[PDB]
Design an enzyme around this catalytic site. Structure first.
Site, PDB file in Angstrom:
ATOM      1  N   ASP B 290       0.838  -1.144   0.069  1.00  0.00           N
ATOM      2  CA  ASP B 290       0.013  -0.009   0.043  1.00  0.00           C
ATOM      3  C   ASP B 290       0.696   1.302  -0.105  1.00  0.00           C
ATOM      4  O   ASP B 290       0.583   2.352  -0.737  1.00  0.00           O
ATOM      5  CB  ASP B 290      -0.910   0.068   1.032  1.00  0.00           C
ATOM      6  CG  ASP B 290      -2.185  -0.990   1.018  1.00  0.00           C
ATOM      7  OD1 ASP B 290      -2.461  -1.364  -0.320  1.00  0.00           O
ATOM      8  OD2 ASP B 290      -2.764  -1.388   1.912  1.00  0.00           O
ATOM      9  N   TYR B 374     -10.286  -1.500   1.511  1.00  0.00           N
ATOM     10  CA  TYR B 374      -9.735  -1.243   2.525  1.00  0.00           C
ATOM     11  C   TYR B 374      -9.523   0.015   3.150  1.00  0.00           C
ATOM     12  O   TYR B 374      -9.329   0.866   2.557  1.00  0.00           O
ATOM     13  CB  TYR B 374      -8.420  -2.015   3.193  1.00  0.00           C
ATOM     14  CG  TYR B 374      -8.579  -3.438   3.286  1.00  0.00           C
ATOM     15  CD1 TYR B 374      -8.097  -4.664   2.744  1.00  0.00           C
ATOM     16  CD2 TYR B 374      -9.607  -3.886   4.272  1.00  0.00           C
ATOM     17  CE1 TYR B 374      -8.316  -5.920   3.175  1.00  0.00           C
ATOM     18  CE2 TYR B 374      -9.725  -5.225   4.908  1.00  0.00           C
ATOM     19  CZ  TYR B 374      -9.280  -6.232   4.132  1.00  0.00           C
ATOM     20  OH  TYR B 374      -9.292  -7.562   4.384  1.00  0.00           O
TER      21      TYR B 374
HETATM   22 CU   LIG Z   1      -7.843  -8.365   6.554  1.00  0.00          CU
END
Ligand SMILES: [Cu+2]
Ligand SMILES: [Cu+2]
Ligand code: NA
Ligand code: NA
Ligand code: NA
Ligand code: NA
EC number: 1.4.3.21
Lengths: 620, 620
Positions: B290, B374
């Site tokens: 990320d 996420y």
């Molecule tokens: Cu997770």
């Protein structure tokens, strides 16, 4: 009306009257423990019988007794004489603590030891400590306390800053005899004071802290009914209080739609041991069983609004018995409140355009106890998402010694000439499980690494494995942080909508367990502390991991004897015992009063619900 | 005036103008990264030079460039052409994400795969994911993204509930070619929706939550000067923001009496990897860096008062560059506030009669980022007692798949036919240490058990041992929870009043590290994640544990190459890199939106102060 209601002052007065009329509470008798008994399994006949268990000490040397009384029927149910050389001594009485210093003040050996050090006996405080079981044959069957000395320069002085090392005495508090005085040599008494309210030590107090105001303009979101029944954000439970264990949680349940679903039948801290790791003969016997030997509930603090508990606080004031059977109220002894707990769930979705945030909160139930130099906070937390968490907060003043010239492998230096011996603080949580009812099982879950090869050609796969614990003899487990080890408590007869057994997962902190040699006295008496997890089959009389009478008990009682029954625990009424603790190498920053350090554990739902249980939380 | 001030919109506009005039920012160019460079070691000559590092991509296929610009002097300092097959590709551009779905919508192979499944291409969302490096020789030197498909039944539908398993495509986003479409077989698309704002799923919202009001009637206790310099309860620091790393803390120092004492020179989360553990060829390549591949700072959320940050909030709004060099403000991207944190220290002393309670508080600095499904919160905490703590909060929507008939060892079932593959979330904290200055060393501290015997006759003693890490080749360390392993960063040339080196102790959570086979691609590219602690000698160009160009880099860059220099780290300018993470086996309760889970680390003073640093805290 609830069988789980707190003991009332009227109940305790009735117990006293029943004991007195039965001839069991004469002038030579003292109540060393009094507590209400939980209902036996299967009390769904409404035939309530409020029964109390009492330990009665005799200051004249007669045998103590264990007595069970029915307040409901006004009768003594049973009274048994105890052979304390066999089954252990009764807990220490508060009134025995002062006896130690007074007796030593007139003992010629003690006075000679103080005279050699030029200490005025009127300035010498004696810490009265539990004795344990060691090499001294004359102590079997006698009530012994051991005393360590500290100098108090003036009435408001912190005596902990001035340990008198090299000196220890043993005292028989029933016969009022000093049995041994041991003087291993003169150490300088550390001279620096440790008075943390003295302006000369604190300096000018900070003026920089602006107030934080926490209020609830419409009151709290929980309700209290029947004195101690809590309902809060789908949780339901009863808050009990016992003079030995302190706060006890009963009947923890979660309202899932139309169903009240049980999770934990009874939750408590059933023992806590503080073993010291200094091999000096002055302290090598030093081990506190705060719960079993001293009874942490009777030393609970009255908690002050705005200082100890901040926010919209609801108090409980539990009632206990004094040594004569009179009711004593611990005013504001239990704080209850809810706390904001940050973000609960959040997502900003690019494809749907929906931005979603919800906030978490927790319900807090806490009390604080003071045993000599140490102060411990016990905190139970319930979260919106079904998590249950316990946290112990350790503070107070560290136990001190001289710091030897030339150093030490077992003592930290805190100030010139002032040492603090290494020690641990180890707790045992007793969790009488009831996941969707009483047919439960425990599985051990480890992460499983996989090898690169056929069916895993890129070497990325990993998995997990679960091992059912089927009998007590295989239910003594150790942590393994490296493999992510956790334990799942499930109900094999209750399935979620995916046809999987409902469960809860225990997450440990994976701190070290008891460090002492396995052949030591403390390893035998605190055997629970040598392993992270124990599972037993429920039994009415298996209450404490150390047995009923911990003080001066020779060892082996409690969990090691229970699990020898090798009972079936696969889909049965089971009890989980989790050991967790802090290993304390004191730092300079812990002196002269120690900032809080913490340890605990938590349980999170694991397929207990059919989806997230917090979808109906509103958007603030 | 401070060299550590946040980048201004005017600075970014000047960078754009400098690049354009130098001929480096034509219509075919895109800025993939822009950030201010930290001052080089020893900038005490006041000769400030604000320099920016820029990665420039070329959408026509020409070689990208790394450029350094001096805003102070208005000049290009250096410009280097990059050979991306050798040193890695540039970070993914936001504008490349939409390219994937559009290109697949006209590809005959993709359309045939969707037609077989009776899916309307207008309803199919494609998650564009980083490619990594695997077996495909044609990808070397090309910018590739891989796409996984999800059905959106209507514009506000959560597509994550409807994965299209058995199908994956690879796309060259520069040449705009679909290189491969892989169809391994038809799986049913899970039909249940996951719309967590739909009343039919949430049920009636709770009416039981009463408000918690947190206010500061006199304002907060911290001050902000120079835009980003914080002073709070003796702490002093600068809050930076970088588009790759997010919030960065500079110059963390503590005012101890008359002395400003440095502790940490620079603290950041320098990488974070999310590796998936499903061996299906549809997902066995799936690993998100990320930080290094996507740049978490550019996806920072604007945080809402009362929802995301509650209390008296002070915001920072950092400025970043868009792909064309225009300044872009992230409004309310950083929240700053203080929080009550319970009891700090407490003791009720029987001998002195003094009752003492003080409350703790912490300063919070946080931001939140969203990458696809996420959402991650990054929280830095400073406590009154000198503790520094980091906490990551993971929430959002779990990545889904079909759940295979007959089960899976690597996928959890969340709903009928709906699976969630196992994965981890692993972070790397880069701590450029400066304990009382730059001459620091790291010691590994283990608990030491002792055997019953001479000098330990009662078998109660225990100790500890410290091992100095002297060279980089011995500074790659693993956790050992069972031995209570911690690491101490000390300054051997700076002593406390007891003549001991001042220090800070790092406490890890001891969670599992990278689980993948050590021979895997991800183990080579995320080598940092295979060990808990690394120590390197500071160097200007050693910024990230994964190297400068993580996207499609073949492996070995970063920490394994740095430590091969085997440099002296015993009393030198050193950098600690700590790996920590969550291993996620998704539970039913994580669906359809996941409650927060957390992981982190903390540093506590270890003889840094001469006594408790919170004696001057007032009594509330
Ligand atoms: Cu997770
Ligand atoms: Cu301690
Ligand atoms: Na015995
Ligand atoms: Na049970
Ligand atoms: Na390469
Ligand atoms: Na450094």
């Amino acid at each position: 009306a609830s069988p789980f209601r707190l003991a009332s002052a009227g109940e305790i007065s009735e117990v006293q009257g029943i004991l007195r009329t039965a001839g069991l509470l004469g002038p030579e008798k003292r109540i060393a423990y009094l507590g209400v008994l939980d209902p036996a399994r299967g009390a769904g006949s409404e035939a309530e019988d409020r029964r109390f268990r009492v330990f009665i000490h005799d200051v004249s040397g007669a045998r103590p007794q264990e007595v069970t009384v029915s307040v409901t029927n006004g009768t003594v149910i049973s009274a048994v004489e105890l052979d304390t050389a066999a089954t252990g001594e009764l807990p220490v009485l508060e009134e025995e603590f002062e006896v130690v210093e007074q007796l030593l003040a007139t003992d010629e050996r003690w006075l000679k030891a103080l005279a050699a050090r030029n200490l005025d006996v009127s300035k010498v405080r004696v810490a009265p400590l539990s004795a344990g079981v060691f090499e001294y044959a004359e102590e079997r069957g006698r009530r012994i306390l051991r005393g360590l000395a500290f100098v108090q320069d003036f009435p408001e002085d912190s005596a902990w800053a001035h340990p008198v090392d090299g000196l220890v005495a043993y005292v028989d508090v029933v016969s009022k005899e000093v049995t041994r005085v041991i003087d291993t040599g003169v150490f300088p008494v550390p001279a620096e004071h440790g008075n943390y309210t003295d302006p000369e030590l604190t300096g000018p107090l900070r003026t920089t802290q602006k107030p934080i105001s926490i209020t609830q303009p419409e009151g709290p979101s929980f309700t209290v009914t029947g004195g101690n029944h809590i309902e809060w954000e789908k949780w339901s439970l009863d808050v009990g209080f016992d003079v030995r264990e302190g706060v006890v949680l009963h009947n923890i349940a979660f309202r899932d739609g139309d169903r009240l679903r049980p999770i934990i039948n009874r939750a408590s801290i059933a023992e806590m041991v503080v073993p010291y790791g200094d091999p000096s003969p002055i302290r090598s016997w030093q081990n506190y069983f705060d719960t079993g030997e001293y009874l942490v509930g009777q030393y609970a603090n009255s908690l002050e609004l705005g200082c100890d508990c901040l926010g919209d606080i609801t108090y409980l004031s539990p009632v206990i018995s004094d040594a004569f059977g009179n009711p004593r109220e611990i005013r504001n002894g239990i704080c209850m409140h809810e706390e904001d707990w940050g973000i609960l769930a959040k997502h900003s979705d690019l494809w749907s355009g929906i931005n979603y945030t919800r906030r978490n909160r927790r319900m807090v139930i806490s009390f604080f106890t003071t045993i000599g130099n140490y102060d411990y906070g016990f905190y139970w937390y319930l979260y919106l998402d079904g998590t249950i968490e316990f946290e112990a907060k350790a503070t107070g003043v560290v136990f001190t010694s001289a710091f030897p010239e030339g150093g030490s492998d077992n003592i930290s230096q805190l100030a010139p000439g002032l040492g603090a011996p290494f020690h641990q603080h180890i707790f045992s949580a007793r969790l009488d499980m009831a996941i969707d009812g009483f047919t439960n099982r425990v599985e051990e879950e480890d992460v499983v690494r996989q090898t690169m090869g056929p069916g895993n050609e890129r070497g990325n796969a990993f998995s997990r494995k679960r091992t059912v614990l089927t009998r007590e003899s295989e239910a003594v487990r150790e942590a393994d942080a490296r493999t992510g080890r956790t334990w799942i408590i499930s109900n094999p007869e209750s399935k979620n909508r995916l046809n999987e057994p409902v469960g809860y997962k225990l997450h440990a902190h994976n701190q070290p367990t008891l460090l002492a040699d396995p052949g030591s006295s403390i390893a035998r008496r605190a055997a629970f502390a040598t392993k992270d997890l124990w599972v037993t089959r429920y039994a009415d009389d298996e209450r404490y991991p150390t047995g009923d009478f911990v003080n001066q008990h020779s060892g082996g009682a409690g969990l090691p004897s229970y699990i020898a029954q090798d009972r079936d625990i696969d889909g049965q009424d089971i009890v989980v015992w989790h050991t967790f603790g802090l290993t304390h190498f004191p730092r300079v920053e812990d002196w002269p009063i120690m900032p809080v350090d913490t340890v605990g554990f938590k349980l999170r739902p694991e397929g207990f619900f059919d989806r997230s249980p917090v979808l109906d939380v509103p958007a603030n």
